[PDB]
Amino acid sequence: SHFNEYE
């Protein structure tokens, strides 16, 4: 849900 984590 955020650009800096894997979703």
Epitope: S1, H2, F3, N4, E5, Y6, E7
Partner: antibody, heavy 114, light 108 residues
């Protein structure tokens, strides 16, 4: 069972400091970002920042840089946010949360009063 | 900072009605728009992430759409359990920021 446990309320004096806790359970928080958010009655929600427990990296909203300190205790799977130099402007409900696969704690109501 | 402008700030509708809430970002957020629902007891849940992906257990009456800077959350047929405070969050750039929220109410 994917729970974030926060205390319901804290009462502290102006000028004091407080350490809010956020105990995770039902998952190991190592690779989840742990965020903190401030909510006050007539204001929009504010993002304070986040910490990644695996390596301790933090990303802060610069408005809260001298006010909040995020840390984690990996051995108890707990995230913390220390607030310093409390004023009545710090009175608010503070939430912790994880991301990705977001899940939020129930919030701690902090009152700063004499 | 990417500032989020959410409208409307309050909305009264009839149960069974279709309701739509919007969030406009200041600059492109590359689809990272999340919608959160908060109940009167303080409980907060993620409903939709990355513009249109429903989170676990969220019913199919909830849908999200949008791109670039313009985003919407739509509830097809309002149910009583949907009466709550809704807010968006951009996760496209640091610092993360929220819309100011939409309080739903039942019209009578």
């Amino acid at each position: 069972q994917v729970q974030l446990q926060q205390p319901g309320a804290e009462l502290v004096k102006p000028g004091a400091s407080v350490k809010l806790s956020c105990k995770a359970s039902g998952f190991t928080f190592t690779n989840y970002w742990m965020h903190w958010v401030k909510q006050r009655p007539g204001q929009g929600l504010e993002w304070i920042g986040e910490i990644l427990p695996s390596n301790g990296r933090t990303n802060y909203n610069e408005k809260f840089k001298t006010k909040a300190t995020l840390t984690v205790d990996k051995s108890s799977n707990t995230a913390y946010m220390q607030l310093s130099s409390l004023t009545s402007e710090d009175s608010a409900v503070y939430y912790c949360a994880r991301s990705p696969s977001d899940y939020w704690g129930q919030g701690t109501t902090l009152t700063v009063s004499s | 900072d990417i500032q989020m402008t959410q409208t409307p700030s309050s909305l009264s509708a009839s149960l069974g009605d279709r309701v739509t809430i919007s969030c406009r970002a200041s600059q492109d957020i590359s689809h990272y728009l999340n919608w959160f629902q908060q109940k009167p007891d303080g409980t907060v849940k993620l409903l939709i992430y990355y513009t249109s992906t429903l989170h676990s257990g969220v019913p199919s009456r909830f849908s999200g759409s949008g791109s670039g800077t313009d985003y919407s959350l739509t509830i097809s047929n309002l149910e009583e359990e949907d009466i709550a405070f809704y807010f968006c969050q951009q996760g496209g750039a640091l610092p993360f920021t929220f819309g100011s929220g939409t309080k739903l109410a039942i019209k009578r």
